From a paper:
Based on the crystal structure of wild‐type [name], a histidine residue was introduced at position 33 of the TRAPK35C variant, yielding TRAPS33H/K35C, where the histidine and cysteine residues are located at i and i+2 positions of the β‐sheet motif around the rim of the ring‐shaped structure. The cysteine residue at position 35 of TRAPS33H/K35C was further changed to histidine, resulting in another variant, TRAPS33H/K35H, possessing a pair of imidazole ligands. When the TRAPS33H/K35H protein was mixed with Co(II) or Zn(II), it showed the formation of pseudospherical cages with a diameter of ≈22 nm, similar to [name] Au(I) 24‐cage. We constructured a number of cages named as follows: Cages made with Zn(II) (TRAPK35C‐Zn(II)‐cages); TRAPS33H/K35H with either Co(II) or Zn(II) (TRAPS33H/K35H‐Co(II) or ‐Zn(II)‐cages); TRAPS33H/K35C with Zn(II) (TRAPS33H/K35C‐Zn(II)‐cages). To verify our designs, we solved the structures of TRAPS33H/K35H‐Zn(II)‐cage, TRAPS33H/K35H‐Co(II)‐cage, and TRAPK35C‐Zn(II)‐cages using cryoEM single particle reconstruction (see Methods for sample preparation and Figures S2–S4 for analysis pipelines). The resulting structures showed that these cages are mainly composed of 24 [name] rings, and the overall shape and bonding network between adjacent rings is retained when compared to the TRAPAu(I) 24‐cage. They form two chiral cages, and each ring forms two metal‐mediated bridges with each neighbor. In the structure of TRAPS33H/K35H‐Co(II)‐cage, every bridge has in its center one ion in close proximity to the histidine residues introduced in positions 33 and 35 as expected. However, a closer analysis revealed that the coordination geometry is unlikely to be a perfect tetrahedron but rather a distorted one or an octahedron formed by 4 histidine ligands from the protein and 2 bonds with other ligands such as water molecules (which are not visible due to limited resolution). [name]‐cages that possess only histidine ligands, TRAPS33H/K35H‐Co(II) cages, and TRAPS33H/K35H‐Zn(II) cages, almost completely disassembled in the presence of 35 µM EDTA (1 equivalent to [name] monomer). TRAPS33H/K35H‐Co(II) and Zn(II)‐cages were more sensitive to pH, disassembling completely at pHs below 4–6 and above 8–10.
[name] has proved a useful building block for construction of artificial nanostructures. The wild‐type protein forms a ring‐shaped assembly comprising 11 identical monomers. We have shown that cysteine‐modified variants of the trp RNA binding attenuation protein, assemble into cage‐like structures with Au(I) or Hg(II), called [name]‐cage, disassembly of which can be induced by thiol‐ or phosphine‐containing compounds. Here, we report variants of [name] which can assemble into [name]‐cages mediated by Co(II) or Zn(II).
Residue numbers in the entry:
A (entry chain iC), B (entry chain 5C), C (entry chain M), D (entry chain k), E (entry chain 7), F (entry chain UA), ...: 3 to 72
The structure:
Amino acid sequence: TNSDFVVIKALEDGVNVIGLTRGADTRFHHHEHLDKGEVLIAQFTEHTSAIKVRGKAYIQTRHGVIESEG
Amino acid sequence: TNSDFVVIKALEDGVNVIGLTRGADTRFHHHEHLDKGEVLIAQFTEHTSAIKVRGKAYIQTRHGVIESEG
Amino acid sequence: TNSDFVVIKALEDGVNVIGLTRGADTRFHHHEHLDKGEVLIAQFTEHTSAIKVRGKAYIQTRHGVIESEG
Amino acid sequence: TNSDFVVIKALEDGVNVIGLTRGADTRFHHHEHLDKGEVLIAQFTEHTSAIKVRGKAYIQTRHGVIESEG
Amino acid sequence: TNSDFVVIKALEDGVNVIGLTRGADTRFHHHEHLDKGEVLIAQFTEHTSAIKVRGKAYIQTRHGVIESEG
Amino acid sequence: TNSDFVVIKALEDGVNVIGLTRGADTRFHHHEHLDKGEVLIAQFTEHTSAIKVRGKAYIQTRHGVIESEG
Amino acid sequence: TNSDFVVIKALEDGVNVIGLTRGADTRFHHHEHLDKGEVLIAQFTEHTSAIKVRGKAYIQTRHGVIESEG
Amino acid sequence: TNSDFVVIKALEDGVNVIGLTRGADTRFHHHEHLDKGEVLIAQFTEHTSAIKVRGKAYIQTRHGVIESEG
Amino acid sequence: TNSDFVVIKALEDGVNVIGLTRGADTRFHHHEHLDKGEVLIAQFTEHTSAIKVRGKAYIQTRHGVIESEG
Amino acid sequence: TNSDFVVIKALEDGVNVIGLTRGADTRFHHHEHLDKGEVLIAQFTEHTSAIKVRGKAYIQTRHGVIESEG
Amino acid sequence: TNSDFVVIKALEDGVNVIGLTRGADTRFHHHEHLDKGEVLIAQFTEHTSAIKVRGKAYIQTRHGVIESEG
Amino acid sequence: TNSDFVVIKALEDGVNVIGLTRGADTRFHHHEHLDKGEVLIAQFTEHTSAIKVRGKAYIQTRHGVIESEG
Amino acid sequence: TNSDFVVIKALEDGVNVIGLTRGADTRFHHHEHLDKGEVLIAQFTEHTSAIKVRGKAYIQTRHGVIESEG
Amino acid sequence: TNSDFVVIKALEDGVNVIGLTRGADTRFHHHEHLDKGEVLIAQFTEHTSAIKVRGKAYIQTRHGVIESEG
Amino acid sequence: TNSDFVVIKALEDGVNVIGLTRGADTRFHHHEHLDKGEVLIAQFTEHTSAIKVRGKAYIQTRHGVIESEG
Amino acid sequence: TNSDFVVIKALEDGVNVIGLTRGADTRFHHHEHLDKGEVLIAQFTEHTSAIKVRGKAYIQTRHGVIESEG
Amino acid sequence: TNSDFVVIKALEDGVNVIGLTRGADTRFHHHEHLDKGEVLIAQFTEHTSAIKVRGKAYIQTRHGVIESEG
Amino acid sequence: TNSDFVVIKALEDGVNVIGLTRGADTRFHHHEHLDKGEVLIAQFTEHTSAIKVRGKAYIQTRHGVIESEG
Ligand SMILES: [Co+2]
Ligand SMILES: [Co+2]
Ligand SMILES: [Co+2]
Ligand SMILES: [Co+2]
Ligand SMILES: [Co+2]
Ligand SMILES: [Co+2]
Ligand SMILES: [Co+2]
Ligand SMILES: [Co+2]
């Protein structure tokens, strides 16, 4: 519900990061734009239950590294 | 009950991710569509107890890495 | 009581995952069908205390990997 | 009192798994039949404090792997 | 008080497992007989504080493996 | 107070295990006899704060293995 | 205050183990004599805060092993 | 419900006689050990509805004689 | 209604004895498993009105001796 | 009214035992199916006054032995 | 008034068994059809005081065996 | 008063069976006609104390067999 | 419940006859010692349900004569 | 509990017949002396549950005849 | 308590028949003198529980015939 | 009534020491078994008034030494 | 009740001194183990009324000196 | 109870004198150390009922002189 975070680095211009709400319904809550080279450190909270990443990006989580190729 | 997440990367167009209800009866509660190259970080919550994945995909959990080919 | 999950991947058509009821008496309360290639991440909850797996399947738990040949 | 599970795989037909009752009085409260190849993941709860396994079987616990030759 | 367990496998016929009472008074509270090849997984409970094993047996605990030759 | 245990195996006939009371006063409250080959798994409780072992025995604790020659 | 213990083995006759009182004023609370070969497993409690060991003895703690030669 | 009895003679060492309780649930109630040569005359009562005999024994009932070869 | 018994001796491993309910509707109420060579003396009670026997077995009643081969 | 029983042994697959209701009106209230070799011990009760047997069967009553060829 | 039964076996097709009512007024209250080879065990109750059998049949009672040639 | 019965088989056409009233007054209360070959099983009741049989018939009672040649 | 007796004749010095308690729990209730030649006629009572005989002895019951060779 | 008797004949001078009480405790109630040739017919009562016979005597019970040699 | 009797015939002059008191206390309650040839049919009653016979006499009981030679 | 003791030493296997109760009725209260070589120091109490010794034994009292030969 | 004592000296390893309960019921209430050479001066108390000595030992009482050889 | 004393003289360095508590529960109460040559005159009281002496010592009581060698 908290206390865990992800690290996303943008590898190209125009990377989109979307947060899905917490509750009975699942609706979009917010989105963020990242330009090439930017780093975002995001946390799981009371209003966020899922994080969706579009665009070429490098992601670090507790389970290791992954690369999105959108 | 809460505070654990899975990482799903879509390896093909049209991958389905389904969340099942938490309660006495089990029913489909929400689903998400993923495009090729896209990444979702999903958490276990107060309305979701099980997660099904349809389509070719790459999954990371606390127990390791698996690949689905449905 | 909660907060622990298993990962099941179906290696054949028609794999059955049965949940057993939590309480004084024990009975089947839910069946799940998996087709060849699908992956299910299932959690221990307030209504489930045991899980039975019939069919050829690949299972990951905190204690390691096992293969069912039912 | 809770939150610990065992993994039992039946290596031959007709394996019996018996659960003992929690309290001042200890009585047999349920048993399960396993056919050759099936897998059961079972949890310690408020009504089960001990588990007995009869028949040839393969068991995984937090302390390692054991085999019953019954 | 609870939430720990031992694994006992009987290496000969007629193995006795005795549970001693928890409290100011210390007395035999229950015992179990194990046939050859059987495996018992036993948990420390609110009514059990000590466990005595008579007969030839193989025991797994968090501190390692031991062999009783009673 | 609880949630910790020792494993004692008797290497000779007539091993004595003595449990000391918990509180302002410290007096013997119980003892147990062990024959050659027997194994006792004993827990720390609300009425026991110290344990004494007389006789040739082999002991397993969280800090390792020790042997008493008494 | 609890949940931590020391293991003392007497290597000579007449080993003294002294407990100091828990509170604002510090004084002797109890002591124990150990004969050659005996093993004592002692726990920290609500009435004991420090432990003194006089005589030749072998001590195991969470931080390692030490030998007293007084 | 009463007024009828069985006679069991032990033909070998270690014969077990088990009594099952009377009521809606059927749980074990008591067991007895017989050494080679002993005779037990047991009655049906308010807390006993079935009797189970393990081991080589010679049994006399109103319907005649039988021999268990366990 | 009460006070009559049957004697069943198992002539093979895995013999099932089933007791049916006493009431308006008839349902399975309990079952027992018997090993090769064991004898059960069962009584008619306030919750049991009929008894079914599956497996090779030898039966004694007031009316004589019969053999089942199911 | 009660306290008397019949013994039926099935000599062919699919033997039917029908119970007739006790009271002013008479109707079928229970069917029982027996496979070849099974034995049923059935008692006259507060809801059963007559018993119909269809199929090849061997029947024992207080008056002797009969064989049905239905 | 109760607790006595007759055994009727139908030796040819179309055997009729009629029960007469108990009380000051005697009237036909039920009848049964039996096909060749069928067996019926019937009891005397609070609504049946006499039984009439038409057709070729074989009857067993406490007084012996009789045959109806109807 | 009750709970005894006679068996009458008609050896010729038109056999009359008459039941006489129980009490201070004695009178015909009911009669039955039997065709050739028929069998009637009749019970002594609260309204019947004596039975008269006219016509050729074969009678079985607890005291033996008799033949009426009326 | 009551009203049935056994006859025990001691064929050697020091024969033990043990009576077990009637109720929910079973324990020793009394015992008797018999010298060579003595005869005891013992009745089933409201505080006794089972009887053990240790030693060489000759026993008479309603079901016949048996000998204990303890 | 009542209404059953034994017959004892004295075959030697000085035969002793001892009666034990009926209740929670088994305490001697009375004894009787018999000279050579005497016959005693003794019944089971509300204050008597067991009978011991010392000396050379001849005993008749419902189960047959025995001879005490003491 | 009642409904059983003995038959005593006096084979010599002066035969004594003594009745002992029924209750917690036992004492002589009555006696009868029989001359040679006389016959007495005596019953067990509410005030009598044991009977002694002194003198040469012939006795008939439910268990057979005996001869007293006092 | 109090404060006096006897000393009993067993000179043979199986010596019996019986204590008689203090009151209007002098009856057995307890017995004790002594093996060869044991010594029992027994006092006179409020529930004890007499002591019987059976078997070969050596007794010391205030009045001197005696030897029981039984 | 008090004011008297015994003196026991242990002449061998492992001498047992057992105290029996004072009252209507008699049971083991405490025991002491003596190593070779030790001396125990024991007193009769309000809770102790008899004392047993097992093992080789030397005993002094008001009546003199005795030697136990258990 | 009181008013009796024992004289102990230490014949070697380090002699231990242990006093045992008076009451239903028996447990160590106090100990005393004696060096070579020292003398202790100890009494019996309401908190002491038994006394143990470890080490080489010379003891005087009302019953005489004894020596401990421990
Ligand atoms: Co935008
Ligand atoms: Co969709
Ligand atoms: Co047991
Ligand atoms: Co089953
Ligand atoms: Co005894
Ligand atoms: Co007179
Ligand atoms: Co002990
Ligand atoms: Co000190």
